[PDB]
Amino acid sequence: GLSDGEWQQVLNVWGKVEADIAGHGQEVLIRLFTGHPETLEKFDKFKHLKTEAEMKASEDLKKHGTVVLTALGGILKKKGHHEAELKPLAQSHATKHKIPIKYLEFISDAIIHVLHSKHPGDFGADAQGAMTKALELFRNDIAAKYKELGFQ
Numbered sequence: 001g002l003s004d005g006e007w008q009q010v011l012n013v014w015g016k017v018e019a020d021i022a023g024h025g026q027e028v029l030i031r032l033f034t035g036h037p038e039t040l041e042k043f044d045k046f047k048h049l050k051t052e053a054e055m056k057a058s059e060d061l062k063k064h065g066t067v068v069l070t071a072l073g074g075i076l077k078k079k080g081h082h083e084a085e086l087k088p089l090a091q092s093h094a095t096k097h098k099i100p101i102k103y104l105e106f107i108s109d110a111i112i113h114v115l116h117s118k119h120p121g122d123f124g125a126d127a128q129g130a131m132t133k134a135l136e137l138f139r140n141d142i143a144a145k146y147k148e149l150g151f152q
């Protein structure tokens with residue numbers, strides 16, 4: 001649960017992402033894969049990437065970063081009223097991709113890391129607080145669907 005002022009902060013931060021969705025999406029995925037290499041093993045189409053240079057050169061990885069961040073932005077713009085948008089993603093991630101909730105924690109922290117890295121001094125404490133709460137809400141609502149499905 002976020003206040004109106006907190007949602008305003010989230011959507012202000014998101015404007016930074018929308019100015020360069022592919023570059024932000026690329027860096028989020030690279031931070032996830034290099035910080036948590038077990039996550040790469042869930043992607044049949046990226047497991048061939050051995051070095052970060054290969055990851056950086058991969059146009060398909062940038063394409064997938066755009067898909068991921070486009071979906072997250074659509075969810076965030078609902079300001080918590082995201083049941084219809086979130087349900088298919090929870091279902092696909094539990095039943096088809098088999099992504100433990102821990103990896104959603106990993107990517108949430110990676111988003112925070114990338115925002116500070118690309119906008120140093122321009123991602124203030126209030127903005128970090130509101131973005132973190134928004135990602136917690138997203139993860140928590142996914143977690144409820146995972147529990148329904150019995151997925152660990």
Ligand code: HEM
Nearest residue numbers: 039042043045067068071072088089092097099103104107
């Ligand atoms: C911000 C969180 C994330 C969002 C919004 C997101 C969104 C999406 C979307 C829109 C798709 C394509 C449609 C679908 O299959 O449902 C996708 C595919 C996928 N997601 Fe996620 N995802 C997230 C986090 C993760 C994480 C943490 C992992 C693994 C560590 C992951 C693994 C995958 C895989 C394996 C695919 C299939 C890729 C393919 O082979 O083309 N996702 N995701």
